[PDB]
Amino acid sequence: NDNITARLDRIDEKLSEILGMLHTLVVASAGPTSARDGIRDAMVGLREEMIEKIRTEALMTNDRLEAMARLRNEESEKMAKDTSDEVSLNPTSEKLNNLLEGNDSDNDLSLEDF
């Protein structure tokens, strides 16, 4: 009975592609509508379609670049900075470290200042 196996390979492969579609399917939250005044439905759609929707201002979101990176499953620079093996310092922190780890040059141990 190889005929039935050959004819069910088709349903097997289309079930596999339905599973792939389900895996790539993305769902959004039911946030407020544009200009408020109502509740938007928890819309569901294809992945790349809603990356396009986010980048076309279809839905208002505080996060755009990192949300896009997460949706497309790519490593973002913000995530890399958060999970960096060595973290650097902004200039204020660099100055603070210089004053902390350096000898007291001015020795301004006076409350009358600042």
Q: Is 30 in the site for other proteins (CB under 8 A)?
A: yes
Around Cβ 105, how many Cβ atoms within 10 Å?
Answer: 7
CA–CA separation, 91 and 11 (whole Å): 61
- Burial of 61-83, coded b for 16+ CB within 10 Å and e otherwise, reads eeeeeebbbeeeeeeeeeeeeee
Token digits for 112? Answer: 């009358």
Structure-token pair, residue 35? 């200009």
66 near other proteins, judged by CB under 8 A: yes
Q: How far apart are CA 14 and CA 9, in angstroms?
A: 9
Residues 10-29 touching other proteins, rule: CB under 8 A, are 10-12, 14-16, 18-19, 21-23, 25-29
Among positions 6, 56, 74, 88, the unique one binding other proteins when judged by CB under 8 A: 88
Backbone angles phi, psi at 39, to 5 degrees: -115, 120
Rule CB under 8 A: choose which of 48, 57, 77, 108 binds other proteins. 108
What's the closest the beta carbon of residue 77 comes to other proteins, in angstroms? 13
Which residues are near other proteins by CB under 8 A?
Answer: 1, 4-5, 7-8, 10-12, 14-16, 18-19, 21-23, 25-32, 36, 39-47, 49-50, 54, 59-63, 66-67, 70-71, 79, 82-83, 85-90, 92-93, 95-97, 99-100, 106, 108-109, 111, 113-114
